[PDB]
Design an enzyme around this catalytic site. Structure first.
Site, PDB file in Angstrom:
ATOM      1  N   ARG A 275       0.798  -1.225   0.000  1.00 32.57           N
ATOM      2  CA  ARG A 275       0.000   0.000   0.000  1.00 32.57           C
ATOM      3  C   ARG A 275       0.833   1.278   0.000  1.00 32.57           C
ATOM      4  O   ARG A 275       0.279   2.354  -0.255  1.00 32.57           O
ATOM      5  CB  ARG A 275      -0.960   0.003   1.186  1.00 32.57           C
TER       6      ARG A 275
ATOM      7  N   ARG B 125     -10.229  -9.429   1.537  1.00 29.68           N
ATOM      8  CA  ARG B 125     -11.417  -9.623   0.710  1.00 29.68           C
ATOM      9  C   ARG B 125     -12.122 -10.924   1.067  1.00 29.68           C
ATOM     10  O   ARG B 125     -13.347 -10.956   1.221  1.00 29.68           O
ATOM     11  CB  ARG B 125     -11.052  -9.602  -0.774  1.00 29.68           C
TER      12      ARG B 125
ATOM     13  N   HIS C 208      -5.702 -14.755 -14.198  1.00 31.61           N
ATOM     14  CA  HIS C 208      -6.983 -14.496 -13.558  1.00 31.61           C
ATOM     15  C   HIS C 208      -8.064 -15.354 -14.210  1.00 31.61           C
ATOM     16  O   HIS C 208      -8.321 -15.196 -15.413  1.00 31.61           O
ATOM     17  CB  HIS C 208      -7.348 -13.022 -13.666  1.00 31.61           C
ATOM     18  N   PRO C 209      -8.710 -16.263 -13.475  1.00 32.08           N
ATOM     19  CA  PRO C 209      -9.682 -17.169 -14.108  1.00 32.08           C
ATOM     20  C   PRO C 209     -10.839 -16.396 -14.719  1.00 32.08           C
ATOM     21  O   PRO C 209     -11.611 -15.737 -14.018  1.00 32.08           O
ATOM     22  CB  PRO C 209     -10.142 -18.064 -12.952  1.00 32.08           C
TER      23      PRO C 209
ATOM     24  N   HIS D  13     -17.244 -22.691 -11.299  1.00 32.45           N
ATOM     25  CA  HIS D  13     -17.713 -21.311 -11.398  1.00 32.45           C
ATOM     26  C   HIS D  13     -17.580 -20.783 -12.828  1.00 32.45           C
ATOM     27  O   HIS D  13     -18.547 -20.279 -13.423  1.00 32.45           O
ATOM     28  CB  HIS D  13     -16.929 -20.449 -10.404  1.00 32.45           C
ATOM     29  N   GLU D  14     -16.388 -20.922 -13.410  1.00 34.78           N
ATOM     30  CA  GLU D  14     -16.142 -20.370 -14.739  1.00 34.78           C
ATOM     31  C   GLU D  14     -16.915 -21.136 -15.813  1.00 34.78           C
ATOM     32  O   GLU D  14     -17.398 -20.544 -16.789  1.00 34.78           O
ATOM     33  CB  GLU D  14     -14.639 -20.377 -15.025  1.00 34.78           C
TER      34      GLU D  14
ATOM     35  N   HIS E 244     -20.283 -19.771 -15.862  1.00 34.67           N
ATOM     36  CA  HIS E 244     -20.262 -18.577 -16.705  1.00 34.67           C
ATOM     37  C   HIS E 244     -20.435 -18.957 -18.174  1.00 34.67           C
ATOM     38  O   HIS E 244     -21.265 -18.385 -18.897  1.00 34.67           O
ATOM     39  CB  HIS E 244     -18.952 -17.811 -16.521  1.00 34.67           C
TER      40      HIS E 244
ATOM     41  N   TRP F  53     -11.626   6.273   4.587  1.00 34.58           N
ATOM     42  CA  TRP F  53     -11.498   4.863   4.143  1.00 34.58           C
ATOM     43  C   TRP F  53     -11.392   4.000   5.386  1.00 34.58           C
ATOM     44  O   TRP F  53     -12.216   3.088   5.551  1.00 34.58           O
ATOM     45  CB  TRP F  53     -10.263   4.652   3.264  1.00 34.58           C
TER      46      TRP F  53
ATOM     47  N   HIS G  71      -9.700  -4.492  -8.504  1.00 34.38           N
ATOM     48  CA  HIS G  71     -10.880  -3.945  -9.168  1.00 34.38           C
ATOM     49  C   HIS G  71     -10.931  -2.428  -9.104  1.00 34.38           C
ATOM     50  O   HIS G  71     -11.489  -1.789 -10.003  1.00 34.38           O
ATOM     51  CB  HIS G  71     -12.137  -4.548  -8.550  1.00 34.38           C
TER      52      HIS G  71
END
Ligand SMILES: *[C@@H]1O[C@H](CO)[C@@H](O)[C@H](O)[C@H]1NC(C)=O
Lengths: 596, 195
Positions: free
Chosen positions: A150, A254, A326-327, A355-356, A359, A458, A486
């Site tokens: 950071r 996350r 990145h999947p 998951h993918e 999609h 924040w 993101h």
């Protein structure tokens, strides 16, 4: 003759040109997301340039047909979607400035590197400096990695992010939105469809109401995880304070997935991780995706296309170069579906594969729709369809029947609590994080947070909403939001919140079709064609219908409900309630690791 | 007693675009249709008139072999009573059609990386085609009220467009070669028989 007929003709022309141009752009992007060469960056940029210019021209063209004089609703929707310039409404100077800002931010994120004060061993977010955040229990290593990220990469993004907010706010206001956050919330908007409409601030209200209902479960998960981590970090965690940010399992907190090791309730019974058994039966990525295909087929869904197996990249390039991992699930158009994932022989990528491929199943379902209506209802419908697959595939049973969990193994109270605690560490932990991050973004775009308090607010919001505190005091020089993927590459984040809400409505209605008995969290929809039939009745729609309806086509309702999520996790709710009957459920925002 | 030149129809190096579909007349020859059926190298072999097993024992005055290339998804439109772009604006089979539609996947010839664009199809037309009509005009279609002056623009689009055939397309978007065999039966004696 009439204006609606000319609109039809124009939309047909647009469809048949856009198929080829989209396939060009997607194929160049694939060749760069698989070869990553300067040459490939150039080809990618050129294809996307042709593509974006074709859109600016075609949006100007589409504005020439007034929506006022159109009655066929699908045509009206395609024209509304086509009548939008985006960044084009800005001047050429401002658009080039914004694109260069986005580029520099993305490259700062992807190439940022920090050096172990120990030696040098520069380490970028990829493998190392991530491996640390996911595997280290040493408090000092976690803190160094967190703060160094950071500071060395976030401080670079601060002025860029300020100018980014300014320019993209101008863009939103030029598109008659009140700010860029409202421009993002405009995904859920539904207009001109009685009893099914939806406004851009109704999302504000519904998200906040559902999170009010989520709070108790999260508070008790927070109390229990704080208890276990205080057991493993005595001198570093106040029993009533907030969780230090660098001790949460990844670079941001996350997901609390990686904390299972230190927080599993019953640590003396079969832990649920096939990571070894897959290695002992000699599973490769081919077997993983074959099993995902078998899952979908067992429910009435089609096999993968042969072009999927031939063109997809399912394994890190053995001797190729770079390749982003990145999947992602690709719908290039022209019936071409692919999956890019650097699959490892683990349980985690085994769930990510389902998951993918969900999609991809969605993409294949609405492939018969017009090109403009080929998308999940809202930004979330796609991700929730992806996640219900992992929900089913992670169930002890599914793993049992797959020969990955010893058939001789009892789904007892304690293993069910262990599975619930893992599932909550992953799913429930991300919800306050996600809501809080998107709320901070929304306020920054709406102008309610001044620049000179950007970060101060924040962290306050981390302490208040998330129950997480920064371990080192950060001056506005920092830009810790932009330190997450993101944020630094201009992606809306509330889609993961709404994904998690929708995915339990879906998964409840589909488990009712599959005749599942017992607590909703133990459900397995494999081998049930009635479930997949119900799911296809929504998937094949694409966005040719406002999401409200598609949602009715599965769950019967048109509202965003947390009650299914809470029904899923009700057993872990009561168990957490008992393992905190004498603890402090909640957190004080005053205690910090640096105030003594 | 010579053999019918079906070889130069099916084994042709290049096929026609569907808007300008290519017709060959077949007469004064003997045809062994059973070899075309038992070739089994076709993804579609649907006869909307006579049974494919039998035509080796039948005679006709004339046979018409029409051939072109479309997308796989579009092959369903090569049939009686179908609507859509191919059956309305390119190749319309009649309702009382009495022939056979043969079609196979031509991925390995009619597609290439970078894009095989040789093949066209008509996208707009003021009205639908009559049975076995053939329109090859390139006049600018006028969608709005302002005349086009033979140049593309606002509400003015060039009628024909190209199939982009890439080797990585889906089977629904892969090039399929189509040959429709029409058998006509007038009081005239029969110059085309089986055996
Ligand atoms: C085309 O070539 C094949 C050989 O691959 C041959 O058997 C056939 O007779 C030829 N003609 C037709 C009409 O198939």
């Amino acid at each position: 003759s009439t204006t609606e007929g000319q609109a039809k003709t124009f939309l047909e022309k647009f469809n048949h040109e856009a198929e080829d141009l989209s396939y060009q752009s997607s194929l160049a992007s694939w060749n760069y997301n698989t070869n990553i060469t300067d040459e490939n960056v150039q080809k990618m940029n050129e294809a996307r340039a042709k593509w974006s210019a074709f859109y600016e021209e075609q949006s100007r063209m589409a504005r020439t047909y007034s929506l006022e004089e159109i009655q066929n609703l699908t045509l009206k929707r395609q024209l509304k979607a086509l009548q939008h310039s985006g960044t084009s409404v800005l001047s050429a100077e401002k658009s080039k400035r914004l694109n260069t800002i986005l580029n520099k931010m993305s490259t700062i994120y992807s190439t940022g590197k920090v050096l172990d004060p120990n030696t040098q061993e520069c380490l970028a977010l990829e493998p190392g400096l991530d491996d640390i955040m996911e595997n280290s229990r040493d408090y000092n290593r976690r803190l160094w990695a967190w703060e160094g990220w950071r500071a060395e990469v976030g401080k670079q993004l601060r002025p860029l992010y300020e100018e980014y907010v300014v320019l993209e706010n101008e863009m939103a206001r030029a598109n008659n939105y009140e700010d860029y956050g409202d421009y993002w919330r405009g995904d859920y908007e539904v207009t001109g469809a009685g009893d099914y409409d939806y406004s851009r601030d109704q999302l504000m209200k519904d998200v906040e109401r559902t999170f009010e209902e989520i709070k108790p479960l999260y508070e008790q998960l927070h109390a229990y995880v704080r208890a276990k981590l205080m057991d493993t970090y005595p001198s570093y965690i106040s029993p009533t304070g907030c969780l230090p940010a660098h001790l949460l399992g990844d670079m941001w907190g996350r997901f609390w997935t990686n904390l299972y090791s230190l927080t599993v309730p019953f640590e003396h019974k079969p832990s649920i991780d096939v990571t070894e058994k897959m290695k002992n039966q000699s599973w490769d990525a081919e077997r993983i995706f074959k099993e995902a295909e078998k899952f979908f087929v067992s429910i009435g869904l089609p096999y993968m296309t042969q072009g999927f197996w031939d063109n997809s990249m399912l394994t890190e390039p053995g001797d190729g170069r770079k390749v982003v991992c990145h999947p992602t699930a690709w719908d290039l158009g022209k019936g071409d579906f692919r999956i890019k994932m650097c699959t490892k022989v683990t349980m985690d990528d085994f769930l990510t594969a389902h998951h993918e491929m969900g999609h991809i199943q969605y993409d294949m379902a609405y492939a018969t729709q017009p090109y403009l209506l080929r998308n999940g209802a809202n930004e979330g419908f796609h991700e929730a369809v992806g996640e219900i697959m992992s929900l089913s595939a992670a169930t002890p049973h599914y793993l049992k029947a797959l020969g990955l969990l010893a058939p001789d193994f009892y789904e007892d109270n304690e293993t069910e609590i262990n599975f619930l605690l893992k599932q909550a560490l992953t799913i429930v932990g991300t919800l306050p994080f996600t809501y809080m991050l998107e709320k901070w973004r929304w306020m920054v775009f709406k102008g309610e947070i001044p620049k000179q308090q950007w970060m101060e607010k924040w962290w306050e919001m981390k302490r208040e909403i998330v129950g997480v505190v920064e371990p080192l005091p950060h001056d506005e020089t920092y830009c810790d939001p932009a330190c997450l993927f993101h944020v630094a590459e201009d992606y809306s984040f509330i889609r993961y919140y709404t994904r998690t809400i929708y995915q339990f409505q879906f998964h409840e209605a589909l488990c009712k079709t599959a005749k599942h008995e017992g607590a909703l969290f133990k459900c397995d929809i494999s081998n049930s064609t009635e479930a997949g039939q119900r799911l296809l009745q929504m998937l094949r729609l694409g966005k040719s219908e406002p999401w409200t309806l598609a949602l009715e086509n599965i769950v019967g309702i048109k509202t965003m409900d947390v009650k299914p999520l809470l029904n899923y996790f009700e057993p872990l709710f009561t168990w957490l309630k008992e393992q905190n009957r004498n603890s402090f459920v909640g957190w004080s925002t005053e205690w910090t690791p640096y105030s003594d | 007693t010579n053999l019918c030149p079906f070889g130069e129809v099916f084994n042709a190096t290049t096929f026609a675009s569907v808007y300008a579909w290519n017709r060959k007349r077949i007469s004064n020859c003997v045809a062994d249709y059973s070899v075309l059926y038992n070739s089994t190298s076709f993804s579609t072999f649907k006869c909307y008139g006579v049974s494919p097993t039998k035509l080796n024992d039948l005679c006709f005055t004339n046979v018409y072999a029409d051939s072109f290339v479309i997308t796989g998804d579009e092959v369903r439109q090569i049939a009686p009573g179908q609507t859509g772009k191919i059956a309305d604006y390119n190749y319309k089979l009649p309702d009382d059609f009495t022939g056979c539609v043969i079609a196979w996947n031509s991925k390995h010839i009619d597609a290439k990386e970078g894009g095989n664009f040789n093949y066209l199809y008509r996208l707009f037309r003021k009205a639908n085609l009559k049975p076995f009509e053939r329109d090859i005009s390139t006049e600018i279609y006028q969608a709005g009220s302002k005349p086009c002056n033979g140049q593309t623009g606002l509400n003015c689009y060039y009628p024909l467009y190209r199939y982009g055939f890439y080797p990585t397309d889906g089977v629904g978007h892969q090039p399929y070669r189509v040959v429709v065999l029409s058998f006509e039966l007038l009081n005239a004696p029969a110059t085309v028989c089986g055996h």
